[PDB]
Amino acid sequence: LVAAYPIVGVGMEKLIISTNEHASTDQGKTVSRATTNSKTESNTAGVSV
C-alpha cells in the first residue's frame, strides 16, 4: 500500500557576489625648451613751447 517514492529539497548555505568595474591609472613626464629672438626700431617727434 505504501509507495516507493523519493522527495528531495534544497537549502541555501551561503551567497557570494562579485563586482564589475574598470579601474585605470596613469603617470607621465614632460620636458621642454624654447628660444626667443626679437628686434624693434622706433621713431619719435615732438614740439614744445
Next chain:
Amino acid sequence: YPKKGLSPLALNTMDQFSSRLIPINYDQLKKLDAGKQIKLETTQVSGNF
C-alpha cells in the same frame, strides 16, 4: 594516473568543451595574496565496468 615515473596532471578550464578559463574576483585575490591556500576535494566519481 599517470604512472609513478611521470609528472602530475593539469587542469585549468571549466566548461563542457575546454574554453573560458576559471576566474577569481578581487577580494579573494587579496585574500590569496596574504599566503592562504585552497583545498581540493572529491565529491563523486563514475566509470564503467
